[PDB]
Amino acid sequence: YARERLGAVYGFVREALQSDWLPFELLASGGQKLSEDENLALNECGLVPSALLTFSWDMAVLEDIKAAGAEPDSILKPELLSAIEKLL
Amino acid sequence: PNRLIVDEAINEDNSVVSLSQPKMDELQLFRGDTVLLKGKKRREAVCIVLSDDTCSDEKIRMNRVVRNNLRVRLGDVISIQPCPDVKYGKRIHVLPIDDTVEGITGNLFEVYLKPYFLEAYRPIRKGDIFLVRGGMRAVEFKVVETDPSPYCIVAPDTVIHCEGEPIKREDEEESLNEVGYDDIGGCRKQLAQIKEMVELPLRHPALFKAIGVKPPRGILLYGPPGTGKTLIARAVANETGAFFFLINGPEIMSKLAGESESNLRKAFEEAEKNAPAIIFIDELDAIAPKREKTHGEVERRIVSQLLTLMDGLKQRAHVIVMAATNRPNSIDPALRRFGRFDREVDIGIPDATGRLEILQIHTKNMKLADDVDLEQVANETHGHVGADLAALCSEAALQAIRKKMDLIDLEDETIDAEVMNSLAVTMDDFRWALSQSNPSALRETVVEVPQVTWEDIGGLEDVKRELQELVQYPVEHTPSKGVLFYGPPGCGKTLLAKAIANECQANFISIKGPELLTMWFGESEANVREIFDKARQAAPCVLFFDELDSIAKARGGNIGDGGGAADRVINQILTEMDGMSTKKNVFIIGATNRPDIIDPAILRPGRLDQLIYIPLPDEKSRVAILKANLRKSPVAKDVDLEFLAKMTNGFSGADLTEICQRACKLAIRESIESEIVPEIRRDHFEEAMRFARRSVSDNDIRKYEMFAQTLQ
Amino acid sequence: NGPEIMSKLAGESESNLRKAFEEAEKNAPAIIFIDELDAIAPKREKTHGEVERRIVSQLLTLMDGLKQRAHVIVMAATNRPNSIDPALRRFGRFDREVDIGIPDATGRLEILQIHTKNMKLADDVDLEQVANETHGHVGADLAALCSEAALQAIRKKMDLIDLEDETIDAEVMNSLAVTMDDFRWALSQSNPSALRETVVEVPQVTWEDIGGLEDVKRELQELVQYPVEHPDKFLKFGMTPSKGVLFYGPPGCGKTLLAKAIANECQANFISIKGPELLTMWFGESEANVREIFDKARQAAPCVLFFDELDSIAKARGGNIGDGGGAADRVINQILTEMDGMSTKKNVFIIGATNRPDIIDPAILRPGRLDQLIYIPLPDEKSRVAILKANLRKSPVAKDVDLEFLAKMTNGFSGADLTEICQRACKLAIRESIESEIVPEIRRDHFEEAMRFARRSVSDNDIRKYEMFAQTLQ
Ligand SMILES: Nc1ncnc2c1ncn2[C@@H]1O[C@H](COP(=O)(O)OP(=O)(O)O)[C@@H](O)[C@H]1O
Ligand SMILES: Nc1ncnc2c1ncn2[C@@H]1O[C@H](COP(=O)(O)OP(=O)(O)O)[C@@H](O)[C@H]1O
Ligand SMILES: Nc1ncnc2c1ncn2[C@@H]1O[C@H](COP(=O)(O)OP(=O)(O)O)[C@@H](O)[C@H]1O
């Protein structure tokens, strides 16, 4: 919904991610970081009628991922990737 | 299809362009998606697309940095091709351009490139040139290597490298520090007028070679020095690509007879060879002063040579001549005949909004402290022009530089980028510079949109509607082009004229008694034509002639000398009014306190056909007046404004204001004395009532009512 | 041309001017045209330079040399006949002059027709409508409009057919027509180069355009036509024809139409002089321009010279207050002098108008000046109906429109106000007509709606002032 809250977008992404529990941030197209716990609507933060967000893992877990030598080569769950569509 | 006309940017950022949403829906790209732009000479650039409420459906808004990378100019067309396949980069090698890195040293990455790209996720393509501002310098960089190709998005995990000598600028590349449209603050309307007249024959010369009708040959820009007359001429030439030739009076007049005229006509010949071109002649009044005011042969012959060169423009295709003067009446009138310089644009003096924008332009490269408020500065810099605001910023910078440089202690040929990056200009440095700066246009008339709105005027609800109808009717549906106000003084005559100008966002030109008297006394009533010319150039505007009877009173009023109701100035005003059309967007308002002795000519059909009576306010209006006057101050709950209004039965709006200001003055006294209370109390109003009196007697009201009944 | 000769060095300007005259004799018969005469030979008493005084003397003697240079006629052009050294206009030299001025409403149409000779115009093109809209335009501007309209038609059609080349097929050229939209576009791009200068023309106003005032129409014919249609009766009875008439009364009653209508039937030029012109002359100490006005009438003859706002001089002297003297002043003194020196044999008739007759300098009403007085009151019941019907001659009127009722209600309305009512009702009927396709006649609803905006321009006290004055004169 154009009036949906930012917390519903974080919930949507968490369900799509391979690891729904792993903290992350979503950066809006205007350079403003979106806070999951902020009561702000999509039509108020400039994500209507359509927008692209930039995904990045929280800095705390990125330090552990790099220090452990783990390549973050999969973001989404195989349950969604098995249905991936190509763009033309 | 999928191609839009290039227009000016609203968002100054160098990595983004703005489309109208319907075209993003046709291209099926979202806000923030990365797209490629296809420009001329088989070049392309990568950027992010957003949308706004101002972009035209068929245009793309992009700034100078993006246009230069595409080798396109305003008015051209480019293709938009979304490229969602763009990946994040791994390593990008960026090197500065030598033309902008001179005199500066230190670690350019830490100061410029790092904060520019950090968490910005800007698209980058090999060969791009982009600008990073800071440290009071504008430094642009060129991308020479990208690990992915030919473009990518920078990420926090992308390696940013910068090693090697600065790159020498190529001959096909333009400097981003050259004056363009984004360097002009106020006077946007005047710039738009130049665009309509000039850009078409320069961008599309093939439209005028096929026809016998020539575009305007000369444009005369006039106004005080330091307002941007030369800046506009240069910005237009640089944005369209026309060759810019600079001429000025002193350069030609300093030469001897023969050499002087040769140089003037040689410049015109060079413009033809380099056409399309713009010839800018500064100090036109110096190169071509009125011939009847000089007896020298050099001055008279140069005027004749310039006149013939202007006529020769019918052969010098695509050459446009622009000239700058202080006033259109300071030059030989021959230049202003049909053809030659028959188009005039008044640049004027920037208002509070324009001054703020000019300051923001000059601070593009400046680091400001958190306490800096340029809007406050723009409000204090009354009478300043852009040249003075440029000096203001420079002087504030120099004061900040001295304060920190005494601690930096870096004595060398170059200055480290880091120590400049930490330098910030604070409010104490702007206020210091304001105290040292002296405006160059303080005595010139300042014309701007007034700040008085309808909520500042108590009562007169029907007059407010009448004025809104008089201005709205000729636009929504012979309509009248002016109104006279009459009635007791201090009831809001001037405020009404300002408030309608405010709501319309129209310029308010105030003509007061002393100005009408000065013109009469000095036999300089010809200045009325300049006043009306200002009103036309300032359109939309409200031209307010206060104290229309000030001269009749100066000549005796009730007694009289050699004259009566009409005088030098009012007759010149009548002369101009009879030539003004309702389509000029100029609304003329008059006011008088003695309508019984005002030249009846002004009320004849076709002139000030509307006539509104402004009586003393009634009881509910007096309360509204007190509330409006006190809207800017804390007022105690014990203050009974209705009780005061009931007592002040014969008081005008001006008289109620005196009461409010008297109560305020007392509040100031008590506050200071107690500190050595925080709101105005009833005791302050009760004391004010002991001194305030009505300024208009009952006999004077009858005089106004009798007139009102006579005319209906 | 002036500025080219003046751009030369001392000695070169005089030699070049002499050569042109010598070449004309060798190539006689020949015409020498000197443009911007005021630039090559400005008034000597208005310049300072030796070279400029020398050039004027050189031209003056070259003009006299034309008695020996057989079959050489010199023509010159200036913007103002009094901006050149008066010696040039002395007997011999430039002893003839012709005032070209600005093309009139008919001439503007003629110019548009001339510059469209080769153009194929569409059925929707109306050059008369353009000529009426192009107020303040001169031939240079009207020619631009025609060329621009032609180019717009070319860019719409030919640029979708042909290449950027030198040659176009004859069939494609002849297949191209210029529409009214192309002329209107050019009109929006052009700007009149002569909007402030006075335009003198034979008016198109006829007697059928004036409602009421039947007796004034006849009186003007007796004053203007009879002195020249029946001169043998004026001589027989020793009558001295009047040189002019002054109109007075409330504004908007047809004073302007009266002067134009008699000029129309007489096929005479109408010259419009307004108050601001007389006011400027006084305050600027340039009353010499009074002679220019009367000389325009002498050169435009037959003509009717109309002085509006004749009270402007009396008002400038104070009007309602003023000093303890009379109305005589510099400008009116020059006006009276020029009138007295004007002969009735030049077929020039002077008409004045004022809205404040009580302050008109009595000198203007003496025999030989504007001795005749005609009162033009607000139209009466039968005249107001005539005015409404006259304005509606251009648009069908529905049977439900009661024009006599409106005339009986609009008792305080002037002819100017009745015209707004008719024209507004016409616009309202047109608005409905256009909307019906997104009507054939003006309906009662359009007149009743028009009455919501129309107002009387003349107050009740103004009427009594005019009636009391007219009664005072008996
Ligand atoms: N309207 C304006 N907007 C922005 N800057 C302006 C404006 N007017 C003047 N300036 C600034 O003031 C200076 C003008 O100096 P100059 O180039 O001599 O032009 P001019 O004296 O004709 O105004 C420049 O630094 C310019 O940036
Ligand atoms: N209707 C009104 N409402 C509020 N304040 C008024 C009103 N009329 C007059 N004033 C006060 O009187 C002062 C002068 O008003 P102004 O319009 O300048 O008078 P004038 O037009 O006679 O010069 C203003 O500062 C205002 O505070
Ligand atoms: N008697 C009349 N018959 C028809 N129309 C009239 C009459 N009187 C005035 N008008 C209209 O009023 C307008 C103004 O007339 P005019 O004589 O110019 O007024 P004034 O010169 O006093 O301002 C004219 O355009 C005309 O259409």
Author numbering:
A (entry chain G): 354 to 441
B (entry chain F): 23 to 499, 509 to 707, 728 to 763
C (entry chain A): 270 to 707, 728 to 763
Paper text:
p97, also known as valosin-containing protein, is an essential cytosolic AAA+ (ATPases associated with diverse cellular activities) hexamer that unfolds substrate polypeptides to support protein homeostasis and macromolecular disassembly. p97 forms homohexamers that enclose a central channel through which substrates are translocated and unfolded; each protomer consists of two AAA+ ATPase domains (D1 and D2), an N-terminal domain (NTD) and an unstructured C-terminal tail. UBXD1 contains three conserved p97 interaction motifs: a VCP-interacting motif (VIM) helix and ubiquitin regulatory X (UBX) domain, which canonically interact with the NTD, and a PUB domain (peptide:N-glycanase and UBA-containing or UBX-containing proteins) that interacts with the C-terminal tail. Here we identify UBXD1 as a potent p97 ATPase inhibitor and report structures of intact human p97–UBXD1 complexes that reveal extensive UBXD1 contacts across p97 and an asymmetric remodeling of the hexamer.
